[PDB]
Amino acid sequence: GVDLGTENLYFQSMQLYDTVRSCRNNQGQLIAEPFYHLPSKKKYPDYYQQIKMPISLQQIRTKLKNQEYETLDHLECDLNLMFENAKRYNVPNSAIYKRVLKLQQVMQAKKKELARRDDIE
Ligand SMILES: [Cl-]
Ligand SMILES: [Cl-]
């Protein structure tokens, strides 16, 4: 009525991304750092034989800038893809797997809030 829904969605998107990227633990360290960039090519070619659709916060960031995310669900799709790769490639007891579960939970809780409100916090 006083906004275009199309525009608010990019604001919601940028908030969801920021919440992941800047997520901190109890100490105050940044849980998402290992997801800032894809693993080296070619120092872990193992990873690329195994992970068919690699994605990290680098590529997500660029997609967001270029308004590729038409809905919050698309962004959540790519963030989930990133978490599920790390969960496929690492074992349940690794620290990084456990950091993914928390991140993913924080991510999904944030997306659910944003969609409930249909507005940024
Ligand atoms: Cl509208
Ligand atoms: Cl790290």
From Swiss-Prot:
**Tissues in which the UniProt entry reports expression:** Widely expressed.
Task: Please name the source species.
Answer: Homo sapiens
Q: State how it assembles.
A: Component of the SWI/SNF-B (PBAF) chromatin remodeling complex, at least composed of SMARCA4/BRG1, SMARCB1/BAF47/SNF5, ACTL6A/BAF53A or ACTL6B/BAF53B, SMARCE1/BAF57, SMARCD1/BAF60A, SMARCD2/BAF60B, perhaps SMARCD3/BAF60C, SMARCC1/BAF155, SMARCC2/BAF170, PBRM1/BAF180, ARID2/BAF200 and actin. Interacts with PHF10/BAF45A. Interacts with acetylated 'Lys-14' of histone H3 (H3K14ac), and may also interact with other acetylated or methylated Lys residues on histone H3.
What stretch of the complete protein does the chain hold?
Answer: 388 to 494 of 1689
Q: Which residues carry this modification: N6-acetyllysine?
A: 41
Subcellular location(s): the record lists: Nucleus
- Disease involvement: Renal cell carcinoma: Renal cell carcinoma is a heterogeneous group of sporadic or hereditary carcinoma derived from cells of the proximal renal tubular epithelium. It is subclassified into clear cell renal carcinoma (non-papillary carcinoma), papillary renal cell carcinoma, chromophobe renal cell carcinoma, collecting duct carcinoma with medullary carcinoma of the kidney, and unclassified renal cell carcinoma. Clear cell renal cell carcinoma is the most common subtype.
* Disulphide bond pairs: none
The name on file for this protein is Protein polybromo-1
From the record heading this protein, give the residue positions of the covalent cross-link Glycyl lysine isopeptide (Lys-Gly) (interchain with G-Cter in SUMO2).
Answer: 52, 98
Domain Bromo: residue ranges: 15-114
